[PDB]
Structures are given as C-alpha cells and as structure tokens.
Amino acid sequence: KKRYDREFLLGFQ
Amino acid sequence: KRYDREFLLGFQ
Amino acid sequence: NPEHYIKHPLQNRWALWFFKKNLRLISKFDTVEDFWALYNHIQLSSNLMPGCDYSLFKDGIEPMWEDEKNKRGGRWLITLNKQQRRSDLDRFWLETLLCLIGESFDDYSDDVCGAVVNVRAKGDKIAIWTTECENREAVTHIGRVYKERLGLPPKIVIGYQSHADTATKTTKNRFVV
Amino acid sequence: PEHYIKHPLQNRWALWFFKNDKSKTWQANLRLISKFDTVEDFWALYNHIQLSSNLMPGCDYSLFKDGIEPMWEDEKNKRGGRWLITLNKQQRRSDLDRFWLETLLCLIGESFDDYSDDVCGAVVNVRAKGDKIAIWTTECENREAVTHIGRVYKERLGLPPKIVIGYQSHADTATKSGSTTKNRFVV
Ligand SMILES: C[n+]1cn([C@@H]2O[C@H](COP(=O)(O)OP(=O)(O)OP(=O)(O)O)[C@@H](O)[C@H]2O)c2cc(N)[nH]c(=O)c21
Numbered sequence: 001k002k003r004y005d006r007e008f009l010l011g012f013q
Numbered sequence: 014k015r016y017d018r019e020f021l022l023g024f025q
Numbered sequence: 026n027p028e029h030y031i032k033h034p035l036q037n038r039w040a041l042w043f044f045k046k047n048l049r050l051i052s053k054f055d056t057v058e059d060f061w062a063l064y065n066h067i068q069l070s071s072n073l074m075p076g077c078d079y080s081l082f083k084d085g086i087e088p089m090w091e092d093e094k095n096k097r098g099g100r101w102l103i104t105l106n107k108q109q110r111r112s113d114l115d116r117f118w119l120e121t122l123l124c125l126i127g128e129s130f131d132d133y134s135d136d137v138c139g140a141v142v143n144v145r146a147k148g149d150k151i152a153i154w155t156t157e158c159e160n161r162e163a164v165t166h167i168g169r170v171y172k173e174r175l176g177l178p179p180k181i182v183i184g185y186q187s188h189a190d191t192a193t194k195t196t197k198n199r200f201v202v
Numbered sequence: 203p204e205h206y207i208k209h210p211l212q213n214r215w216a217l218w219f220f221k222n223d224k225s226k227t228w229q230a231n232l233r234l235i236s237k238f239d240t241v242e243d244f245w246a247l248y249n250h251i252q253l254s255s256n257l258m259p260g261c262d263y264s265l266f267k268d269g270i271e272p273m274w275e276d277e278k279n280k281r282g283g284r285w286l287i288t289l290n291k292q293q294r295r296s297d298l299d300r301f302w303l304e305t306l307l308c309l310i311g312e313s314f315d316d317y318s319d320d321v322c323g324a325v326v327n328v329r330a331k332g333d334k335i336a337i338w339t340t341e342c343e344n345r346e347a348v349t350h351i352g353r354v355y356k357e358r359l360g361l362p363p364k365i366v367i368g369y370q371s372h373a374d375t376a377t378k379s380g381s382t383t384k385n386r387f388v389v
Contacts, residue, residue: 021126
C-alpha cells in the first residue's frame, strides 16, 4: 500500500 | 559408576 | 577402609542452575555427598514462585536448547496440574535427579544432557533432555526406564519432543511411552 | 501537508542490536534499540548509529516489523526462512554497508510488491569468518512469495546474475549452522 521507491527514500537522508 | 536409588537415598 | 573417608564420585560432574521468569549457576558437584548437601540447602520445586526453573545439566552443557549438545536433541516431558504440584512434583523431580546422577539408563545414560523442572501457574513441567532425537533406541530406552522409575501406570502416556519441533512447530511427539 | 507532515511507512519497524557477551544466553544478548514508522524517523535513526562495518565482530543489527521478534521462535518466523547473502572480508569494506542500507530500503519501502507482506525482517551479522545479511520471510512453503522476494532482492543489490544466493528454512538452520544448512530455494 504505502510504497516508496529507492530515490525517494534516499532524497531524505 | 552407576548407583541404584536405594544406595543414593541412604545418604539423604 | 576407604568408604569411611572418601566421597563417592559420580560418573559425571553436574551443574545446577536457577532461572527466574535471570539465569544463575547455583553449584557444580561430582559426588553423592555433595549432591545431597546441595539438595538439602535449596527450596523444593513446589515452593518456588511460578516462573522459576531448576536445571541439572552435565558440566559443559548449557541448559539451553541451542547448545550444540541439545540442538539436535529433545526432551521426555512430564506435565503436572496444580493438584500434582502437591503430590507428585517434588518426588518426581528428586527421582529425576537420582536417574541422572546414578546413571540409571544403562548404556544410554551417555545420551542424557540434563533435566528441567518448570514451575508455572498454568501447569508445572519436568523433562529429561537428551542429545539426539534420531537415536531411537537410546530415546526409547531412556523413556521406558524413566516412566517405570516414576511409577506411572501403563494407561498414562508421556511424549518425547525434539527441541527444534517445539521451537519451530502436527503432533509434538516423535516418541511416546 | 507535504510541508509539515512526516511520510508514514506502511509498517512500524523495530531495530534490534545483539552484542556477543559470551557469559549470557543468545536471547539475553538481544536489545531493542528503537522503533520508527516514518521515512524521516528512519533516517534520524540510521544517521545516529554505527555502520555495520564498524561493529565489533560477533554483533548484529536486526530490523523487524513491530510485533515480530528477531528470533526463529516467533510465530511469524517459525515456519519461515531467510534469503542469505554471505560476505568475505574484502566485502566488509566494499559491500557490507551499501548492501545493508539497500536491504533496509527494500523493507521500509515495501519493494517486494504483492509479497512484501511475507517479509518479517532482516539481520546483518558481523563475523570474523564472514559477515552475513539476510531477509527473513514468514513461510518457507510460499514458493512464489519466496522466489519473488529473492529475485527482487538480488536485483536491488546489483549482484551479477551468475552469483547464486540461497534460501534456508529456520527449522533446518536451527539443528545445523548457517554454512552446513541446505538451500530450499536458490536465486
Ligand atoms: C538467529 N539465532 C541464532 N541463534 C543462536 O546463535 C548461534 C549463532 O547463530 P548466528 O548468529 O545466526 O550465526 P553465526 O555466524 O554466529 O554462527 P553459525 O555457525 O551457527 O551459523 C546459533 O547457532 C544459535 O545457537 C538463535 C537461537 C535461538 N534460540 N533463536 C534464534 O533465532 C537464533
């Protein structure tokens, strides 16, 4: 349901 | 070394 | 006459452990005399608070199923109700200790690792742990002698469960006697 | 809303630490570090803690879904198994930290599509004989779930196709060791 791709998550570091 | 129960209980 | 002053060595050196709901080593012993001196200084299992265990394990075998000497093994399991706490727990546990220290299972006493009494509000447990649940004859012989040593009538059945099955899950038992 | 609301994760996650104290039992060596359920809180946690490659050998991190303990005995694990990645000492330097981060990202981002529900957690073991990273899944008999997870994980790690990874059931691992237990699946 709540899915985040790799580049999205890595944008937040 | 094996001890039967009566022998062991004799020490109680 | 050496019987006058020499202690009676056990076949094995044994470690008694206590566990509450932390795991403590109580004492290690290797004679009949040191066994009783230990037994006479500690609470009877029936006087333990629910959640406590005693474990008697051969020295060098940790009282945990993951130990290399237990991981492939299992336990003969005696389950007791609250009425049996009163009438059976202490005598069954002593008898179990006697079976262990007296090497009562003949050539198959080598397969014994230890024994555990669990005192619990929902039903106390006593168990003899063995090293290898694939040793069918060993487990079976130990089972049969233990049952007769506890004076359990033929009608009653006890099960042997491998530690890996208990941990990992349709019958629990791989042997019954 | 995007300006001020944290980004919620599908699941709440618990990070566990294991230290090799040889005087305590395995279970007793397990420590809960923290729980989180947002992208932002994940990063706050990640940026605060040691890289795996800086851990003392004998130590572990585990990231597990909240309600699932990082041990075989948990109901969600007892019938399950792990996709295992085994690393040599050269890989500690070059691959461990990037592989572990990527594994974290696969979990929190729900990267296994339909089968992300089969995932329980992941463990990194730092060891003198070779580090390990593993994704734990719930049911060893879910062949399609297990294969999909393995194949996506392998792709995400960027492992050359020729490098085979194995899936070991916990039941099998429990009575043997990590390098004597056989593979139920490969990818
Ligand atoms: C994941 N795990 C590990 N262990 C214990 O810890 C021992 C080491 O396992 P582990 O840290 O996963 O792997 P290692 O590289 O240190 O050693 P290995 O040769 O046994 O693979 C293992 O053999 C068990 O005795 C466990 C004991 C449990 N009761 N439950 C577990 O989940 C569990």
